[PDB]
Amino acid sequence: GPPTSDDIFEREYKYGAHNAHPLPVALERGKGIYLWDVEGRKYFDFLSSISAVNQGHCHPKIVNALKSQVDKLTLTSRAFYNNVLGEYEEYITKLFNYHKVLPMNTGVEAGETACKLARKWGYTVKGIQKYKAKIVFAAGNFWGRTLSAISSSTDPTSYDGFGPFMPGFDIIPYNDLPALERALQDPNVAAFMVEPIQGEAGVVVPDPGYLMGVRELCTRHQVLFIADEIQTGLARTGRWLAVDYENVRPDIVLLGKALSGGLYPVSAVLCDDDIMLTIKPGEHFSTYGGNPLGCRVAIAALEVLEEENLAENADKLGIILRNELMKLPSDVVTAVRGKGLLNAIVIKETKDWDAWKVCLRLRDNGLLAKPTHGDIIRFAPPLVIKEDELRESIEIINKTILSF
Amino acid sequence: GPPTSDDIFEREYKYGAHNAHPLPVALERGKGIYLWDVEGRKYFDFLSSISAVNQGHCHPKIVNALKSQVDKLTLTSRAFYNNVLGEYEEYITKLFNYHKVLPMNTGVEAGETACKLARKWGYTVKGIQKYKAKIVFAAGNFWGRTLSAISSSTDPTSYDGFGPFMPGFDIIPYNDLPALERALQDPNVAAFMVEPIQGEAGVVVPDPGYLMGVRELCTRHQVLFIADEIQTGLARTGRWLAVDYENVRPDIVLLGKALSGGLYPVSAVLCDDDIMLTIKPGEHFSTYGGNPLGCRVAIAALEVLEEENLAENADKLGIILRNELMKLPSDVVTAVRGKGLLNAIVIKETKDWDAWKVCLRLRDNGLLAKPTHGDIIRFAPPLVIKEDELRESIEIINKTILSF
Numbered sequence: 001g002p003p004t005s006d007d008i009f010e011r012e013y014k015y016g017a018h019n020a021h022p023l024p025v026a027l028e029r030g031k032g033i034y035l036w037d038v039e040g041r042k043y044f045d046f047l048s049s050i051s052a053v054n055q056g057h058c059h060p061k062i063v064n065a066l067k068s069q070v071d072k073l074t075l076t077s078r079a080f081y082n083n084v085l086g087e088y089e090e091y092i093t094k095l096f097n098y099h100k101v102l103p104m105n106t107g108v109e110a111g112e113t114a115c116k117l118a119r120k121w122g123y124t125v126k127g128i129q130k131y132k133a134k135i136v137f138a139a140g141n142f143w144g145r146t147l148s149a150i151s152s153s154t155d156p157t158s159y160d161g162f163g164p165f166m167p168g169f170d171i172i173p174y175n176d177l178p179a180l181e182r183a184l185q186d187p188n189v190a191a192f193m194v195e196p197i198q199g200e201a202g203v204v205v206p207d208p209g210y211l212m213g214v215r216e217l218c219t220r221h222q223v224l225f226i227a228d229e230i231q232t233g234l235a236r237t238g239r240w241l242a243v244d245y246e247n248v249r250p251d252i253v254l255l256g257k258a259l260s261g262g263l264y265p266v267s268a269v270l271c272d273d274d275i276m277l278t279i280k281p282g283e284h285f286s287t288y289g290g291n292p293l294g295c296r297v298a299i300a301a302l303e304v305l306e307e308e309n310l311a312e313n314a315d316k317l318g319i320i321l322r323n324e325l326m327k328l329p330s331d332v333v334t335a336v337r338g339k340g341l342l343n344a345i346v347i348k349e350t351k352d353w354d355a356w357k358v359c360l361r362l363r364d365n366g367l368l369a370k371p372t373h374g375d376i377i378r379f380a381p382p383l384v385i386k387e388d389e390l391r392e393s394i395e396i397i398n399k400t401i402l403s404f
Numbered sequence: 405g406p407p408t409s410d411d412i413f414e415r416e417y418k419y420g421a422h423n424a425h426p427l428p429v430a431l432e433r434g435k436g437i438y439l440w441d442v443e444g445r446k447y448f449d450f451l452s453s454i455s456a457v458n459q460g461h462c463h464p465k466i467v468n469a470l471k472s473q474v475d476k477l478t479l480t481s482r483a484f485y486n487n488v489l490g491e492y493e494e495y496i497t498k499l500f501n502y503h504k505v506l507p508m509n510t511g512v513e514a515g516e517t518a519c520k521l522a523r524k525w526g527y528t529v530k531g532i533q534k535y536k537a538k539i540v541f542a543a544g545n546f547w548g549r550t551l552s553a554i555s556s557s558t559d560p561t562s563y564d565g566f567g568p569f570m571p572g573f574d575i576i577p578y579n580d581l582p583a584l585e586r587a588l589q590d591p592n593v594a595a596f597m598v599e600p601i602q603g604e605a606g607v608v609v610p611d612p613g614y615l616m617g618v619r620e621l622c623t624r625h626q627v628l629f630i631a632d633e634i635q636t637g638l639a640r641t642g643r644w645l646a647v648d649y650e651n652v653r654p655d656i657v658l659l660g661k662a663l664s665g666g667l668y669p670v671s672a673v674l675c676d677d678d679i680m681l682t683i684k685p686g687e688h689f690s691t692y693g694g695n696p697l698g699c700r701v702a703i704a705a706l707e708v709l710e711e712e713n714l715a716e717n718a719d720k721l722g723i724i725l726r727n728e729l730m731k732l733p734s735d736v737v738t739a740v741r742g743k744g745l746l747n748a749i750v751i752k753e754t755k756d757w758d759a760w761k762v763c764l765r766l767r768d769n770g771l772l773a774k775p776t777h778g779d780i781i782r783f784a785p786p787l788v789i790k791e792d793e794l795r796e797s798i799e800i801i802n803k804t805i806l807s808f
């Protein structure tokens with residue numbers, strides 16, 4: 001017969017690095033909100049690959065765009081032009097209303113690019129002395145696992161044993177305007193990079209007015225506001241960008257994950273000419289960045305979000321999810337939080353009972369989720385989920401939680 | 405009618421960052437060794453997307469692998485297991501003969517991962533005090549454009565305006581064994597990262613015995629030998645790895661680019677257990693790393709290389725290429741170099757005549773190549789090229805050079 005789930009776990013243990021920490025389920029097929037394991041068991045996906053399959057697994061519009069282009073041309077590198085990139089660039093810049101886009105592959109690559117842009121703008125436009133430029137980050141931040149990314153992390157698991165660390169990165173508390181105002185007194189700060197909602201920190205939602213205050217302070221002190229929307233963007237929270245909730249325009253926007261609906265690693269840095277054009281020809285590139293195959297899948301992925309009105313559906317259904325979760329006993333679920341379909345519960349963890357064990361039983365009962373911490377479980381289904389499917393999922397969540 | 409080449413160039417100028425320095429040609433289709441522009445003009449590909457399409461453009465076996473998996477499952481993230489990754493891991497580890505592989509997406513991500521491995525091994529196994537670990541690099545090195553990668557560069561265009569820089573990165577001359585020996589006297593050195601041939605530096609091949617000497621020095625001093633085979637590996641130089649020419653076994657091998665045949669961003673870090681397992685569960689992973697779609701194309705990409713005996717081809721045909729190139733007048737072309745089908749020519753550059761000019765005329769005569777420097781031109785056609793195809797290309801190169 002074919003490999004069992006245990007066969008699959010065992011082979012990876014033998015031949016693969018032990019760098020990940022997966023929930024033990026072994027998936028072989030996905031469609032829409034559903035995943036199937038190698039034994040044929042069916043599950044509601046409530047993780048969406050960390051919000052990278054907002055459009056559902058294997059969306060036929062995005063699949064078709066990939067299959068069509070793969071027969072024509074997949075990669076020239078940046079040594080030559082391809083015919084598709086410009087069409088994607090015009091589309092995405094007009095959608096989000098920035099002059100320009102710089103295409104990258106992974107989320108961390110887009111963050112690296114934003115730091116370089118901020119620094120280069122800092123030195124060549126603002127006039128900071130080389131090499132004294134600072135970038136300010138919020139505690140709890142996550143933007144990937146390069147050496148530079150972990151240098152700004154407050155999570156010991158990401159940075160311990162991996163230094164020495166990149167200089168010029170400062171850390172302040174999240175959701176803390178007085179602290180930003182204090183940090184921005186230093187003329188050498190070029191940018192503040194921040195998530196509108198912190199995903200990996202446990203879906204930490206800042207108070208109303210935070211984002212307007214950040215925009216105000218950054219403008220006041222001539223500092224770039226970089227909004228990392230790699231997890232929160234693209235209809236996930238109920239808008240094109242989570243910053244749309246307070247109608248503020250960051251200087252640089254980062255996109256990734258669901259930019260391709262899961263079909264291809266595509267990320268993007270959006271900003272106006274006065275920031276973008278600080279990087280000159282030859283000063284920054286990658287092999288796969290802007291390749292025609294990725295661009296065709298990103299165009300289709302973005303069109304799906306628009307056409308199916310997934311932002312509106314995420315807004316409507318998320319409030320149902322939160323309100324239903326809030327009905328669970330307080331001696332069990334101590335907090336419910338989120339926006340749109342990016343949500344989390346906090347459980348009253350004991351020594352015998354934690355998020356991991358809850359998630360294992362969830363899995364056994366046909367729903368896949370994963371903790372961010374011993375007491376925090378993230379809930380993020382694909383945005384194509386219908387209300388009846390959500391309520392079926394809610395029933396599974398209730399039954400599971402109350403069975404301990 | 406459709407866009408012209410100028411249309412395509414102008415749309416990117418308006419809506420895309422000005423960060424690439426491309427040769428002006430607008431490609432829409434690629435099959436095997438051939439590329440077609442938007443006017444329908446046909447070119448020999450003599451760059452292979454910087455050795456990323458060793459297997460030719462749109463190889464039907466790798467295309468089939470993509471089309472087959474895209475309908476099943478494309479992305480779970482590493483929060484869950486997929487059924488394909490382990491099959492890929494067993495296959496690639498047994499092929500190159502290392503215990504384990506850590507999957508990443510882009511080349512620079514593989515390099516960052518290797519630096520993290522070297523540091524954590526440095527602290528936990530070698531006993532270096534945190535955070536005093538050093539990694540040594542060679543002048544002329546290229547491994548990408550993250551902040552960390554540019555912090556090891558000797559190219560001002562990569563690092564200027566982007567500081568401050570990552571500490572703990574030391575630089576010595578390439579092809580210099582005494583310099584390495586002197587650097588490795590410092591017990592806080594964890595690793596030496598080096599290309600067996602430097603691609604971007606202009607196909608700089610080190611003297612016979614260099615790699616054997618690097619291996620000896622690293623072993624003596626308990627330092628990890630990291631070989632970056634992202635450009636040189638996968639049959640490009642006429643072996644599975646350029647390092648095979650001297651029977652040398654690095655501690656860490658980096659693969660990327662042609663690992664997917666240009667169909668998907670896939671990179672790999674290969675090393676044994678005592679190094680790999682210094683990273684513990686949850687300490688390093690990315691969203692798209694190890695996804696089933698990428699793994700399916702990577703297995704097919706590798707099988708093509710093996711099945712079609714492309715290393716053997718690259719070796720025989722590269723000997724012909726260099727032989728014919730050396731027949732050119734010694735005052736116009738000053739040096740010919742390379743291994744397999746990674747080759748370059750150095751030209752007697754004048755005020756009015758340079759590599760860029762030669763490559764513009766080459767393009768006009770139906771052959772695509774790109775300068776590495778004002779006086780250096782790289783030639784790297786896909787490895788599926790037959791002898792008669794190569795000879796036709798050679799006459800086009802011959803005619804063009806002597807047409808000035």
Ligand SMILES: *Cc1c(COP(=O)(O)O)cnc(C)c1O
Pocket residue numbers: 050106107108109111142143144145195199228229230231232256257689690691692
């Ligand atoms: C996932 C994530 C990233 C990193 O994306 P990768 O593609 O995994 O490198 C960056 N920022 C945020 C907010 C993310 O959620």
Ligand SMILES: *Cc1c(COP(=O)(O)O)cnc(C)c1O
Pocket residue numbers: 285286287288454510511512513515546547548549599603604632633634635660661
């Ligand atoms: C191209 C290259 C890389 C980086 O590859 P990307 O996928 O463009 O990040 C790293 N090392 C070497 C030697 C390379 O040629």
